[PDB]
Amino acid sequence: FPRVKNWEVGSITYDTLSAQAQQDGPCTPRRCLGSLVFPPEQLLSQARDFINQYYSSIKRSGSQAHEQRLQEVEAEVAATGTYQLRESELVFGAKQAWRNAPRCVGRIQWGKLQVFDARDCRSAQEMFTYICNHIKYATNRGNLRSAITVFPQRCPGRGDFRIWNSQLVRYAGYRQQDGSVRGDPANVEITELCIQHGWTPGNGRFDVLPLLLQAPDEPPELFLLPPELVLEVPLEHPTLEWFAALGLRWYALPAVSNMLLEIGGLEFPAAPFSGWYMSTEIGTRNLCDPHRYNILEDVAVCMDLDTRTTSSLWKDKAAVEINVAVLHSYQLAKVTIVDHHAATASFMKHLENEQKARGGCPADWAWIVPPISGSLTPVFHQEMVNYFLSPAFRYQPDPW
Amino acid sequence: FPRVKNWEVGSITYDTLSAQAQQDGPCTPRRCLGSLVFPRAPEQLLSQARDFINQYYSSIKRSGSQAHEQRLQEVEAEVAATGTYQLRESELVFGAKQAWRNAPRCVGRIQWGKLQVFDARDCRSAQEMFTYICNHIKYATNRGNLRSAITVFPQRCPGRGDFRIWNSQLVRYAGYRQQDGSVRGDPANVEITELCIQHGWTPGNGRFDVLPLLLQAPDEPPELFLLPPELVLEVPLEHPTLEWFAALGLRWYALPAVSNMLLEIGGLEFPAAPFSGWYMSTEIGTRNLCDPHRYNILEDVAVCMDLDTRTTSSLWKDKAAVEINVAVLHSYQLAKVTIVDHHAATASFMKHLENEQKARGGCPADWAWIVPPISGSLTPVFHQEMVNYFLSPAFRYQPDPW
């Protein structure tokens, strides 16, 4: 049972939960790969395990109703080759995957999640309206609310429900007469697919991409989003009057539409989850990463900083002010957003919660520590154990 | 063989070097323990030494030669006769450079070949040990133009206890448990400070009192030695545009000299082999001064900056820490004392990884230690995947001798 220390306070815990880890991770006694991003009837083992989880949680181990539900899934797989999840189970499992996500720093919220069950979905113009309910629900005029919509569980012999975009809101990226990119370069490829499938490209740098939505075996179909449903925030700085002129914006709803929810051995390749943003996500990664918007040197010129020597820390000053603008902009617009201090402190709280409840917590240190000011947040000084619990969110190959 | 991607650029390389990982670390396929700070007969001494000698002869382009098999048999015949063996001087110099090269948590490894090696394996007493240490500090400090150096004291051997430097670094500031329940000085150093007093040191009571050395000779209690003040070069901390900053009274010392780690070379063990380089600004400005469990000046600076410390979203912590780092860089540059910032350091470490891939087919690296503790993703190492593993020769942790 791994010994885990917090170096700010000196306290020690033991991760007894780590013993359950199923899908073995990427590391070996020989080498550590913790820093790498992307490192028939077995279906009943994973469903038995999940159902046993559900009842224990509602204090219902070893009972009539516990006995009972094990048999129906036994018979369901026997006849048809899979099974259907009871409504409450799909809800319980959606929350558990979130609770189990090692790279999510906001899991103190894991118990408050709105589950839209789209399992009876049947087409692309159908898909679009489920997605469109979710978005408008979760956005809620800026008072953001966590939601996951769950589309049909994949089956053999038939195609797949998949969202071809990484997120529900994504900006375009276009090459040029010199190869380089206007717009967001994280989405250069999916932009090229959309322009291919009929979409008329804009000139702008913040063109909200049309959803490529795909129903089983039928090809994708472009689905222009209602611009009044895409809540956005123009970026301004509280005291740097010129920051607004830079013309920067980001969207309100972070909604991940390419991961594959897995409950009880069942795989839902379309299950968009959404919450709200941590400011460093926008202001540090999205805007300042060299391979993303790469605005850092432009804000430093406008601040009349000395970009000629790295020891002026001009990169660090400009970055802090870009983050201030994000928090200021979002707060002015009344869109739910949380700073990396408030958020990491709440995750520390979560770890103590999960300590008493489940005896530990899988956390990925490299993803919990924020990309600025890491050692100024408490999680920096917290040792962490990383492992895989089910149910979970998993990565999946792109549908091409 | 692990595929390793650079997310900033799109580069892809495979780490074949990891295949030869000598010892084992704490992770398994069940679970990663990478973020843990402390993750821990003649025949096996033989195959270790055999491996190092094979290394040494490869570096001098003599692999498979007369001299190469001569040394092998020499070493075997000596472990047979004595249960151990002695390194040649040139083997020792190569061994200490490799250990630097192999150290997964050092971001400064671009320099690994520029290392001055003081052979002190003839040392006899704590007193001779003290003299060797002062000569080390003197040469490395070099009046502010710092030089990388290591001093190697006698190896562990059957029949005799170890040499040990009880201090974790050659220059450390006292930490006195206080009136309330607080610490005056550096709270990382209360234990060693208690030990020095318990061994006859007359305590000071400032915040930056330099500690005496406790030097341990084989089968002897530690002996207290005071460092001559004129030999510990310090830097008063001032801010280039914030003139009230000098009234904080903060200082730091020039020479980072780690003194409690163990140098391992072809199976031989050197529990006393202190080494020194020059500081990266974040060690002082972020960690040593802003850590809540260290000098913890972050809120005091922020108030002085007239930042609004009542809400986190104003990013007062971020802004105050950036200025503390600025002050460190400026103070060391004003005082003409070598220093590298996390941007310069991480960029040069990226060249090191490129040198190492061509030379050895990879590089062992502890991501969470290489990425700076401020402005992480602003530096290029954040966006670089890394493989962490243990190669020998090596610097290892060892327990406190008390």
Ligand code: HEM
């Ligand atoms: C409500 C507030 C939430 C906040 C502030 C938050 C914050 C974050 C952040 C900062 C990341 C790192 C992502 C990156 O840097 O690429 C992350 C990852 C993740 N989050 Fe959350 N999250 C929230 C809610 C949720 C919800 C509702 C779910 C699912 C139902 C979720 C599941 C995940 C997963 C699976 C990842 C891993 C993403 C990946 O591997 O690319 N989180 N979260």
Ligand code: HEM
């Ligand atoms: C010349 C300039 C050098 C720079 C800028 C540098 C940089 C660094 C930094 C910033 C750390 C992390 C320290 C911490 O966060 O506690 C580190 C760790 C380390 N360095 Fe270097 N270094 C230098 C020279 C050297 C030399 C000369 C050696 C040995 C011969 C060495 C061996 C090590 C070791 C063993 C560690 C890990 C120590 C530990 O695990 O506590 N470095 N280095």
Ligand SMILES: C[C@H](O)[C@H](O)[C@H]1CNc2nc(N)[nH]c(=O)c2N1
């Ligand atoms: C190479 C490195 O593992 C990679 O850049 C990771 C590090 N930590 C991260 N953490 C978060 N939250 N998001 C990321 O994209 C990354 N990138």
Ligand SMILES: C[C@H](O)[C@H](O)[C@H]1CNc2nc(N)[nH]c(=O)c2N1
């Ligand atoms: C628990 C966590 O691993 C610990 O705080 C580490 C993180 N990374 C670090 N990185 C460096 N360079 N030095 C440190 O002391 C630490 N501490």
Ligand SMILES: CNCCCc1cc(C)cc(N)n1
């Ligand atoms: C590249 N990351 C995509 C968006 C990540 C994310 C997802 C969620 C659900 C919340 C959040 N705060 N952040």
Ligand SMILES: CNCCCc1cc(C)cc(N)n1
């Ligand atoms: C806990 N380590 C404290 C000193 C670390 C260190 C050591 C060396 C040799 C150089 C450096 N720049 N930093």
Ligand SMILES: [Cl-]
């Ligand atoms: Cl994003």
Ligand SMILES: [Cl-]
């Ligand atoms: Cl230090």
Ligand SMILES: [Gd]
């Ligand atoms: Gd101007």
Ligand SMILES: [Gd]
């Ligand atoms: Gd001033």
Ligand SMILES: [Gd]
């Ligand atoms: Gd004061």
Ligand SMILES: [Zn+2]
């Ligand atoms: Zn690992």
